[PDB]
């Protein structure tokens, strides 16, 4: 009684549908391995969350600049721009901080509920009871979302499909920067100016 991504299409046996967003869409038969499904769901969560973060960080500056509130440079040349700190130094700081963060995440994934305790101050005790959703004061301050059964399903579906939308949108933005030398919203303006003569087939 669960809608499928394709009407009248039989869902894969392993794709039960209990997990949020499971619409029986696995054409490549990739997730049939017993040990791969958890890795797939965690990877999709991380991918969608970082993709939507990057989607905000890309779309908001260009939109604000074209409105007029801000006067920030574009994303596809920001790396080659004047900064107080050297680019390599910043990158090393980034990789170190992310090494700590993901190391914690990887330890959580491999060993369930093993790194919920803060070493320096053992009086924190993260509250998350599911892998990939640690919650806690640092990551879930207000406490929204956590409720009864079938309440988490709809909001997690919202999260995963919003992340999918943002991820495909950011792929589109990168493809734009590869094909046109201007921001995607300016391409929206161009598509609005002459819609029947401005599309993908026009200047492929």
């Amino acid at each position: 009684d669960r809608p499928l991504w394709l009407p009248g299409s039989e869902a894969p046996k392993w794709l039960d549908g209990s997990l949020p967003g499971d619409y029986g869409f696995d054409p490549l038969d990739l997730a049939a391995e017993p040990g791969r499904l958890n890795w797939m769901v965690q990877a999709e969560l991380v991918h969608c969350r970082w993709a939507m973060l990057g989607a905000a960080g890309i779309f908001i500056p260009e939109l604000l600049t074209k409105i007029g509130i801000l006067n920030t440079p574009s994303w596809y040349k920001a790396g080659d721009a004047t900064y107080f700190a050297d680019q390599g130094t910043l990158f090393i700081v980034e990789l170190l901080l992310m090494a700590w963060a993901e190391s914690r995440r990887w330890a959580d994934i491999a060993r369930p509920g093993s790194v919920n305790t803060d070493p320096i101050f053992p009086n924190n005790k993260l509250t998350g009871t599911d892998v990939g959703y640690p919650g806690g004061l640092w990551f879930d301050p207000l406490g929204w979302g956590s409720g009864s059964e079938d309440k988490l399903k709809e909001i997690r579906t919202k999260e995963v499909k919003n992340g999918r939308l943002a991820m495909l949108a950011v792929l589109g933005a990168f493809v734009q920067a590869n094909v046109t030398h201007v921001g995607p919203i300016d391409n929206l303006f161009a598509h609005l100016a002459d819609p029947y003569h401005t599309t993908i087939l026009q200047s492929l």
């Binding site: 050297d86 680019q87 390599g88 130094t89 330890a107 060993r111």
Partner: protein, 192 residues
């Protein structure tokens, strides 16, 4: 607890000083091999501990560094004029022979110690102050091994930095990192 949540090895349960269940490659399966590795790690670390002040202090006062010592620091001639006021003492025939003979003698006398427990810790007839009994033994060993591991990694950093920058020292590197924190670090050589 080098990584929380990871099972400890069966032989590495956390009884000896400095144990944190860290042996991913599995070289300590044999208890005697584990003892030999303990002795070797402690020796490497203790030598690094002894050497580190002797290479930071001269630069702190402004004497020399790795390239200066290895190329010309009165070492190949001049009859040891390096130490503030020139003192003759010895030269190439002496500072090239007595050191090697003394180190060979001490290594041979250490090799002639039967007890592995004394091999990992000399203990007896050595201590002038006799502070081994005064303080807790386990705490003293833990502090010694932790400072020794810090000294070992610090000395590896000294060697790598000296190789990366000829004719330089750790203290000037520290000054450069203090004065220009975001333009002189690992990045200048990771991304040249």
């Amino acid at each position: 607890e080098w990584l929380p949540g990871n099972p400890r090895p069966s032989y590495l349960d956390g009884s000896a000083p400095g144990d944190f269940g860290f042996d991913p490659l599995g070289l300590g399966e044999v208890p005697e091999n584990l003892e030999r590795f303990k002795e070797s790690e402690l020796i490497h670390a203790r030598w690094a501990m002894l050497a580190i002040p002797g290479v930071l202090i001269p630069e702190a006062l402004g004497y020399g560094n790795w390239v200066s010592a290895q190329k010309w620091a009165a070492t190949p001639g001049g009859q040891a004029t390096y130490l503030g006021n020139p003192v003759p003492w010895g030269n190439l025939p002496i500072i090239l022979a007595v050191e090697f003979i003394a180190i060979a003698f001490v290594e041979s006398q250490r090799n002639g110690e039967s007890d592995p427990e004394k091999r990992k810790y000399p203990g007896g007839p050595f201590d002038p102050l006799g502070f081994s009994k005064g303080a807790n033994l386990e705490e003293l060993k833990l502090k010694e091994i932790k400072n020794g591991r810090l000294a070992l990694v610090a000395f590896l950093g000294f060697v790598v930095q000296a190789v990366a920058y000829p004719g330089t020292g750790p203290l000037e590197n520290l000054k450069t990192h203090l004065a220009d924190p975001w333009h002189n670090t690992i990045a200048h050589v990771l991304i040249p």
